[PDB]
Design an enzyme around this catalytic site. Structure first.
Site, PDB file in Angstrom:
ATOM      1  N   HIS A  68      95.305  35.620  14.529  1.00 10.14           N
ATOM      2  CA  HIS A  68      95.532  34.551  13.519  1.00 10.14           C
ATOM      3  C   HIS A  68      96.826  34.803  12.740  1.00 10.14           C
ATOM      4  O   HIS A  68      96.788  34.934  11.493  1.00 10.14           O
ATOM      5  CB  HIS A  68      94.303  34.391  12.637  1.00 10.14           C
ATOM      6  CG  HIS A  68      93.194  33.662  13.311  1.00 10.14           C
ATOM      7  ND1 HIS A  68      92.084  34.308  13.799  1.00 10.14           N
ATOM      8  CD2 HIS A  68      93.011  32.341  13.561  1.00 10.14           C
ATOM      9  CE1 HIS A  68      91.262  33.425  14.329  1.00 10.14           C
ATOM     10  NE2 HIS A  68      91.801  32.205  14.181  1.00 10.14           N
ATOM     11  N   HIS A  72     100.530  32.421  16.538  1.00  6.68           N
ATOM     12  CA  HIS A  72      99.462  31.402  16.736  1.00  6.68           C
ATOM     13  C   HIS A  72      99.914  30.084  16.102  1.00  6.68           C
ATOM     14  O   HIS A  72      99.863  29.057  16.786  1.00  6.68           O
ATOM     15  CB  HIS A  72      98.115  31.878  16.192  1.00  6.68           C
ATOM     16  CG  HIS A  72      97.069  30.816  16.199  1.00  6.68           C
ATOM     17  ND1 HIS A  72      96.632  30.229  17.365  1.00  6.68           N
ATOM     18  CD2 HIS A  72      96.369  30.246  15.195  1.00  6.68           C
ATOM     19  CE1 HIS A  72      95.685  29.345  17.081  1.00  6.68           C
ATOM     20  NE2 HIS A  72      95.510  29.334  15.751  1.00  6.68           N
ATOM     21  N   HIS A 106      98.179  25.510   9.704  1.00  5.29           N
ATOM     22  CA  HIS A 106      96.718  25.261   9.798  1.00  5.29           C
ATOM     23  C   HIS A 106      95.926  26.555   9.549  1.00  5.29           C
ATOM     24  O   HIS A 106      94.755  26.420   9.220  1.00  5.29           O
ATOM     25  CB  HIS A 106      96.320  24.563  11.112  1.00  5.29           C
ATOM     26  CG  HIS A 106      96.101  25.522  12.234  1.00  5.29           C
ATOM     27  ND1 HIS A 106      97.144  26.167  12.844  1.00  5.29           N
ATOM     28  CD2 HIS A 106      94.977  25.989  12.809  1.00  5.29           C
ATOM     29  CE1 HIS A 106      96.675  26.969  13.784  1.00  5.29           C
ATOM     30  NE2 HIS A 106      95.345  26.891  13.777  1.00  5.29           N
ATOM     31  N   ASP A 107      96.507  27.747   9.735  1.00  4.40           N
ATOM     32  CA  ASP A 107      95.803  29.051   9.518  1.00  4.40           C
ATOM     33  C   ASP A 107      96.540  29.915   8.480  1.00  4.40           C
ATOM     34  O   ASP A 107      96.345  31.146   8.493  1.00  4.40           O
ATOM     35  CB  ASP A 107      95.617  29.825  10.827  1.00  4.40           C
ATOM     36  CG  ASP A 107      94.408  29.392  11.660  1.00  4.40           C
ATOM     37  OD1 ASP A 107      93.372  28.995  11.076  1.00  4.40           O
ATOM     38  OD2 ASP A 107      94.483  29.524  12.882  1.00  4.40           O
ATOM     39  N   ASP A 217      94.649  23.838  18.703  1.00  4.77           N
ATOM     40  CA  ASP A 217      94.121  25.120  18.172  1.00  4.77           C
ATOM     41  C   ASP A 217      93.561  25.992  19.295  1.00  4.77           C
ATOM     42  O   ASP A 217      93.707  27.222  19.195  1.00  4.77           O
ATOM     43  CB  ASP A 217      93.037  24.878  17.134  1.00  4.77           C
ATOM     44  CG  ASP A 217      92.945  25.969  16.094  1.00  4.77           C
ATOM     45  OD1 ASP A 217      93.611  27.031  16.252  1.00  4.77           O
ATOM     46  OD2 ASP A 217      92.226  25.736  15.130  1.00  4.77           O
ATOM     47  N   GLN A 269      83.056  34.047  27.674  1.00  4.14           N
ATOM     48  CA  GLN A 269      84.191  33.118  27.961  1.00  4.14           C
ATOM     49  C   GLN A 269      83.704  31.867  28.711  1.00  4.14           C
ATOM     50  O   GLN A 269      84.025  30.748  28.242  1.00  4.14           O
ATOM     51  CB  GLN A 269      85.308  33.852  28.707  1.00  4.14           C
ATOM     52  CG  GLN A 269      86.092  34.801  27.813  1.00  4.14           C
ATOM     53  CD  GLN A 269      86.840  34.053  26.738  1.00  4.14           C
ATOM     54  OE1 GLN A 269      87.901  33.487  26.971  1.00  4.14           O
ATOM     55  NE2 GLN A 269      86.265  34.002  25.551  1.00  4.14           N
TER      56      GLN A 269
HETATM   57  C1  LIG Z   1      80.004  31.240  18.211  1.00  4.67           C
HETATM   58  S1  LIG Z   1      80.960  29.748  18.631  1.00  4.67           S
HETATM   59  O1  LIG Z   1      80.830  28.747  17.616  1.00  4.67           O
HETATM   60  O2  LIG Z   1      80.770  29.444  20.014  1.00  4.67           O
HETATM   61  C2  LIG Z   1      82.663  30.188  18.459  1.00  4.67           C
HETATM   62  C3  LIG Z   1      83.286  30.049  17.218  1.00  4.67           C
HETATM   63  C4  LIG Z   1      84.627  30.383  17.052  1.00  4.67           C
HETATM   64  C5  LIG Z   1      85.348  30.857  18.126  1.00  4.67           C
HETATM   65  C6  LIG Z   1      84.721  31.007  19.367  1.00  4.67           C
HETATM   66  N1  LIG Z   1      85.485  31.473  20.441  1.00  4.67           N
HETATM   67  C7  LIG Z   1      84.951  32.285  21.391  1.00  4.67           C
HETATM   68  C8  LIG Z   1      85.718  32.729  22.428  1.00  4.67           C
HETATM   69  C9  LIG Z   1      87.071  32.302  22.490  1.00  4.67           C
HETATM   70  O3  LIG Z   1      87.798  32.664  23.407  1.00  4.67           O
HETATM   71  C10 LIG Z   1      87.550  31.423  21.394  1.00  4.67           C
HETATM   72  C11 LIG Z   1      88.916  30.863  21.316  1.00  4.67           C
HETATM   73  C12 LIG Z   1      89.643  30.413  22.384  1.00  4.67           C
HETATM   74  C13 LIG Z   1      90.852  29.931  21.898  1.00  4.67           C
HETATM   75  N2  LIG Z   1      90.865  30.060  20.597  1.00  4.67           N
HETATM   76  N3  LIG Z   1      89.661  30.629  20.192  1.00  4.67           N
HETATM   77  C14 LIG Z   1      89.350  30.933  18.860  1.00  4.67           C
HETATM   78  C15 LIG Z   1      89.226  32.262  18.480  1.00  4.67           C
HETATM   79  C16 LIG Z   1      88.932  32.582  17.160  1.00  4.67           C
HETATM   80  C17 LIG Z   1      88.758  31.596  16.207  1.00  4.67           C
HETATM   81  C18 LIG Z   1      88.890  30.270  16.587  1.00  4.67           C
HETATM   82  C19 LIG Z   1      89.181  29.936  17.914  1.00  4.67           C
HETATM   83  O4  LIG Z   1      89.264  28.581  18.030  1.00  4.67           O
HETATM   84  C20 LIG Z   1      89.015  28.009  16.728  1.00  4.67           C
HETATM   85  F1  LIG Z   1      90.123  27.262  16.278  1.00  4.67           F
HETATM   86  F2  LIG Z   1      87.862  27.217  16.788  1.00  4.67           F
HETATM   87  O5  LIG Z   1      88.793  29.134  15.845  1.00  4.67           O
HETATM   88  N4  LIG Z   1      86.704  31.068  20.461  1.00  4.67           N
HETATM   89  C21 LIG Z   1      83.382  30.666  19.541  1.00  4.67           C
HETATM   90 MG   LIG Z   2      91.517  28.313  11.621  1.00  4.97          MG
HETATM   91 ZN   LIG Z   3      94.094  28.327  14.561  1.00  5.56          ZN
END
Ligand SMILES: CS(=O)(=O)c1cccc(-n2ccc(=O)c(-c3ccnn3-c3cccc4c3OC(F)(F)O4)n2)c1
Ligand SMILES: [Mg+2]
Ligand SMILES: [Zn+2]
Ligand SMILES: [Cl-]
EC number: 3.1.4.17
Length: 313
Positions: A68, A72, A106-107, A217, A269
């Site tokens: 983050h 990003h 955004h972050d 995102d 994944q």
């Molecule tokens: C438990 S759940 O709700 O399924 C849940 C929640 C959040 C991320 C995830 N999750 C898991 C596995 C992943 O590779 C990713 C991923 C791929 C690309 N970006 N991000 C991601 C990472 C970190 C933060 C983020 C992300 O996107 C967001 F912008 F949404 O905020 N995200 C899963």
């Molecule tokens: Mg965010």
């Molecule tokens: Zn982001």
């Protein structure tokens, strides 16, 4: 006025493609963003001195966390650049101005932790913003930087054009709260299927910009496999640190964030591609046909994770 940013030939060509990686040279990213603003908006929409000062203040307010971070920020802005450049006629002048800034910001001041961890920690931000905790913070930091002296990149908008662009940016940043994505994509899916989707309905535009924000995102899952695989390491480095901090509070973290359950990442994944990423880019392709390359690249990476599971890598 006549000072056009230009990139080396390979970047000039590859920056136009959805799967472009901004590269490891930090000092080129400001120039890559200005280049994108100038082509997607015009050389006139921002005062270069003001824009350059805004970008460097935004950079300074991104932290040195594994994922983050400033890279990003610029990566998410580039995906938005590719969408706007493939959908030239669909977006207003204010939207093109607002959305690249929204993506870059955004972050802002992300600590590498989810809203859930802030809530369980009892962080002050969780008391100030009960839902979309970090996302309301990101918008707050955007307005704070906009209000630094010499930093108002929008100062030539009218009162109402100014309030309109800050409203585009607020909704756009709030939409990056993934908790809100599921319901938003469901509504867009229903509106698309029943043919009620109306881009002249402001509330429908809001929804469509929301999904674009989710798509930009998540865009690490739309890169070439080597970029996607190596970004996954940065993503999981933050998850595991959050898992560690959860254990410090006396709370067993979800497997996604447990570094002891590192073996389960490939199946985790698949879940995320199937539950979040593929649905996201499918609905986006339905609404905006030219964003199909994001769906295709996403599917290619889902197949690469299937290959990891089958021990084929
Ligand atoms: C438990 S759940 O709700 O399924 C849940 C929640 C959040 C991320 C995830 N999750 C898991 C596995 C992943 O590779 C990713 C991923 C791929 C690309 N970006 N991000 C991601 C990472 C970190 C933060 C983020 C992300 O996107 C967001 F912008 F949404 O905020 N995200 C899963
Ligand atoms: Mg965010
Ligand atoms: Zn982001
Ligand atoms: Cl153009």
């Amino acid at each position: 006025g006549l000072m056009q940013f230009t990139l080396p030939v390979r970047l000039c060509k590859e920056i136009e493609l959805f799967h472009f990686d901004i590269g490891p040279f930090e000092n080129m990213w400001p120039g890559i963003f200005v280049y994108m603003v100038h082509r997607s908006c015009g050389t006139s929409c921002f005062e270069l001195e003001k824009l350059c000062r805004f970008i460097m203040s935004v950079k300074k307010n991104y932290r040195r966390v594994p994922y983050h971070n400033w890279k990003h920020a610029v990566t998410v802005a580039h995906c938005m650049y590719a969408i706007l450049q493939n959908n030239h006629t669909l977006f207003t002048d204010l939207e093109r101005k607002g959305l690249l800034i929204a993506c870059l910001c955004h972050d802002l001041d992300h600590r590498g932790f989810s809203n859930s961890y802030l809530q369980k920690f009892d962080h002050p931000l969780a008391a100030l913003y009960s839902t979309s905790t970090m996302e309301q913070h990101h918008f707050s930091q955007t307005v704070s930087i906009l209000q630094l002296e010499g930093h108002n990149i929008f100062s030539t908008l009218s009162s109402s054009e100014y309030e309109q662009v800050l409203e585009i940016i607020r909704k756009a940043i709030i939409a990056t709260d993934l908790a809100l994505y599921f319901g938003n994509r469901k509504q867009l899916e229903e509106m698309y299927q029943t043919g009620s989707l109306n881009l002249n309905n402001q509330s429908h535009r809001d929804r469509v910009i929301g999904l674009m924000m989710t798509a930009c995102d998540l865009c690490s899952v739309t890169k070439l496999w080597p970029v996607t695989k190596l970004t996954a390491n940065d993503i999981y480095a933050e998850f595991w640190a959050e898992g560690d901090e959860m254990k410090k509070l006396g709370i067993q973290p979800i497997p996604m964030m447990d570094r002891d359950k590192k073996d389960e990442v490939p199946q985790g994944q698949l879940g995320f591609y199937n539950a979040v990423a593929i649905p996201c880019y499918t609905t986006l392709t339905q609404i905006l046909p030219p964003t199909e390359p994001l769906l295709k690249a996403c599917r290619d990476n889902l197949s690469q994770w299937e290959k990891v599971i089958r021990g084929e890598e």
